[PDB]
Symmetry: D2
Subunit: 282 residues, 4 copies
Amino acid sequence: QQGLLATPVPAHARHLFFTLQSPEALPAALDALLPQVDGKQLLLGVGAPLAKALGREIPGLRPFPLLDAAVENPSTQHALWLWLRGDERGDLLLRTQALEQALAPALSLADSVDGFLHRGGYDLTGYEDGTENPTDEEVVQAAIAADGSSFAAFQLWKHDLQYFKSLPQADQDNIIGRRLSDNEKLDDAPASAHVKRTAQESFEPEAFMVRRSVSWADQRGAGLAFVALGKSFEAFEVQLRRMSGLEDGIIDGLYRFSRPLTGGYYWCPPMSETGVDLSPLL
Amino acid sequence: QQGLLATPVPAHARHLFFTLQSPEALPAALDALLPQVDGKQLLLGVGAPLAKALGREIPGLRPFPLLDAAVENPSTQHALWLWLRGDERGDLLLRTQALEQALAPALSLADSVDGFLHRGGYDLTGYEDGTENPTDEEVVQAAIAADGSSFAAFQLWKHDLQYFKSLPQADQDNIIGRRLSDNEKLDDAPASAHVKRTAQESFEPEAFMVRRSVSWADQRGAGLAFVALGKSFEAFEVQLRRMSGLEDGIIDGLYRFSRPLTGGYYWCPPMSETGVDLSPLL
Amino acid sequence: QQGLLATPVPAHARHLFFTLQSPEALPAALDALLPQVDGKQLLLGVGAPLAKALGREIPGLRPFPLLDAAVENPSTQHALWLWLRGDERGDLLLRTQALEQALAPALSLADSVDGFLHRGGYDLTGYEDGTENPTDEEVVQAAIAADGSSFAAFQLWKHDLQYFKSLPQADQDNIIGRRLSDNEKLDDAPASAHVKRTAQESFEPEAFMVRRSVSWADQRGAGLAFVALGKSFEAFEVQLRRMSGLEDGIIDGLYRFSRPLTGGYYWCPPMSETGVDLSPLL
Amino acid sequence: QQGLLATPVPAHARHLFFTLQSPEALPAALDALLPQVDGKQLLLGVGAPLAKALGREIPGLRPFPLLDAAVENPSTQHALWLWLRGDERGDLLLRTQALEQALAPALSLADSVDGFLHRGGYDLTGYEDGTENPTDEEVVQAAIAADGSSFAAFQLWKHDLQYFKSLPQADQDNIIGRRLSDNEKLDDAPASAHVKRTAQESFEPEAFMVRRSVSWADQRGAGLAFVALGKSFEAFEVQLRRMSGLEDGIIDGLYRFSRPLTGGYYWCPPMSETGVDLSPLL
Ligand code: HEM
Ligand code: HEM
Ligand code: HEM
Ligand code: HEM
């Protein structure tokens, strides 16, 4: 298993997404990338088109779903995902440039996210995200599968901070479901509150998930880079359909000030005694 | 019917895409937008989430499909599409700013494309696109349905012009399927050639489509804003699955230098005697 | 003389600015650029640092001035200026990419402007700019010097169209100095009106200038790409100091909704019988 | 005196630059800005156009100079400079948005720089900048004037890291003047080496300066946000003219891979017992 759960998470992150355009050059790119995948500073996630391009099908791996709902959750599935973690923001910028060159011409950089951990684990709106994460011994049970693989879901949410912060504090709390002044759950908030929509125990058959989100800021705006780890995509997909109003006509309140710009499913390979284990994909 | 087929197409275009975030303000936005939808200078297309948000389901309208293939065709379905056509590039920039304000706060601008018709109907690579479009009397038959509605598919393709133009002229012709020097079909080009993949008569049960694409240039790069009109999405979707290698393991050659950045299905409402006919959606 | 005065001006323009960073490669770049400088589709202007890097000083050529005033006129002097004119917007985008490669590594692209002529010669605010340009036989007298050279001043003004158009029509007319409804001069507009500040006959010793501005739109916003030709920079510099409030404490009204982002002086070489004449610079 | 010299410098910075466009609203903006200027987390610097707009002239304050040289040092003088320092990158992004709103409509944001201290005080090229800064007791003598004011010079340098790092390590060391492997001065490096050009003791009449630069990364690229404090601009201006080749025809080697994009002079007001002292400007 990689270090998708190590605490504390470094102060900065960098999410890279690549499109496979020259498959004949892929062996040369993998021979220079895999010796660097340590699982702690550089994490790897295989996307559905990369498995499909190699003809081998990975169990549980599939593209980001298409949700015919009243809210827009885009499916921007890419072939490869590189998760860079580190305290030095400049070192992550230098390494992503080195990774971008070593992967060409097989993989072209399709998306990049300059992430940072805001106030140890707070969203830019001030609300502490990650409060209801499973305990340190429940995390491995909920995020890791049998082989040691994890199935991660990424979503780049763009916030309208000027609009959300202009609303009264009661309206902001009813959207999140928690008080900003003390992080206490509003037990009588509307069912459209985010914590009401995503109450992990409210889903009768489904289980929990391990979130590893960070904040971001670009020319595209700012918001939260949502990361959800789990032994399968079932925990995340039942949540997103619940938030989108598919389980019942109630739409999550987050969609009033924030909307996801990207979305993808990526299978995180296990860590063997010799680097990252991509043997099932050969 | 709107003016989706009028010839000649103006020298400039502007494609606007909106996300519905404040549905309570939608009646105020529609009362200022619909009197402007003339069908010739301003065209309208309803997206699946907009029909789903109103509870009324439009026959044939559905989100952009998810294609589990070795190539990436993103599904960036939005709620509303505004197609602006005109010869004055500055007038289209002034009008999109006026449309952006009149639609707030019900609809927020999610995507915008500054389009232009390059050399009367040529792609930036120099290849004449639109040669095999149906004749002027076959267009209405292939693009318009029974009621007068059309089902359009939009895709923002980003070109790597520095890479495509660096290849030898024979390699460039084998990717397109036509000679650049005379627009003649290479009858012995690989089946992965774009004209070989999209031979409208090669699809045994399916029909044709009416393309109305234009070129674009942004900070995101440059390429082709692909527009495909038809009486249904069946003509376009069978083409894209063919290009993606789903019908047979042959992937279109366009994916070696170009990749789509967006993708959406939009139902174009008919034109009654009093403006645009959105009666089925009420 | 080049074609800096040809009427009508093409519907699109492209202004390229280069910084000289590898001077040892300059001879290789000039041998591929000068055979293309026709004066009509591709115009050239030498900047002060390029003349200073070659040790030869051109009479009249100097960097864009520094105006210690209450308004900001930046001095973004570059080494080389390429003025591309043409009706096909896509052809100008393809040619600037070819010019960018042929000039490397001697000259790196420092700035680029995608310009268009709005409504034949109107500013995005609707006001017709170029009404008081000298007549077709006075233009050569006011723009061309003895040898056939012209001294051009470039300024990239960024408009706040949302603010200017929100003001009442009387306030907008008092800023420009002309009525928007009929392009008639407001003889009792404040002296801070743009036409009052730039009345070419109000400058007692100075002469006129020939303007060749176009509109632009970028990720930086939109506005006017101001071009002022003349037999010397004296006509333009006395205007800008007048607008900045240096001649008298009255500041031009344009600075309330627009501000220049760049600024540079460039000497346009004459056209001999064999291409562009850069002989004085050798 | 403000906290322009406090050690250690926080891990992140944010430089904001404003243009005065609505001077009638300036009193309302100052009454909300000055109570926040603490000198440690929020620093303030007055530009020449702001002093000129108020009619009061500050001794020593003048716009960024115009250097007629073979290299381009732009003069992008603005009216107001806000220097935000803090360890939380997200808090600086939230505060710059609050400062941007409280300053409107008097001051519009003209430029913004998201800065970070790379590896405690290293440039993105790996070279330790700030080694030859004056000692902790020489800093106040070299940076602070009689009243407690400081005169700062800002320059946004954009690096070509892909080009500088492609050169051999000996070429990179000859440009900087120090070995990358041990930060030791190359006593026989060319006079065009940056440390050879900027040897603080080589300037016979002039003194030293206190640098407080940080690294940056934007859509414009990446590089160093150069900050030079001093009791006057004489120390910095004699350096820049030396680097530009004005003192002798030797041009600094930094201009081969990096070029400044902005440039401005700003007078830092002293700190009285009641906030920032802007009394001379009234
Ligand atoms: C803009 C996007 C998002 C924001 C601002 C956000 C913010 C928050 C906040 C502040 C909390 C409260 C912390 C806690 O109760 O532990 C929370 C809880 C949670 N969120 Fe999100 N979140 C976002 C996206 C998502 C998405 C898309 C999902 C799932 C598809 C998700 C899943 C969860 C879960 C499972 C919880 C735990 C709540 C509980 O167990 O009671 N989050 N989120
Ligand atoms: C970067 C994207 C694209 C480029 C550069 C491009 C370019 C071209 C060119 C140069 C032709 C030859 C003109 C002709 O034979 O009429 C052509 C034909 C055609 N294209 Fe595309 N195209 C693109 C995307 C698409 C897509 C995504 C589809 C369908 C899903 C499509 C459908 C067609 C069809 C139906 C034809 C007619 C070919 C025939 O009937 O023989 N195009 N395209
Ligand atoms: C945002 C920037 C600018 C805008 C929107 C603008 C717009 C206009 C307009 C609408 C006119 C009236 C047309 C006419 O009277 O011929 C005009 C006139 C003129 N402008 Fe500008 N202009 C700008 C910048 C400048 C600058 C910076 C200068 C000189 C330094 C300049 C020089 C002139 C001159 C000489 C005239 C002729 C007025 C006369 O002779 O009565 N323009 N401008
Ligand atoms: C891209 C821009 C720049 C880079 C990468 C850079 C980098 C460096 C480095 C690595 C050093 C060696 C550290 C040391 O000796 O203390 C240095 C020294 C120095 N730099 Fe820069 N610098 C830049 C811009 C400037 C500018 C524009 C100036 C002045 C106008 C300046 C003034 C100095 C001074 C005074 C020293 C001290 C050298 C000595 O006293 O021996 N720097 N710089």
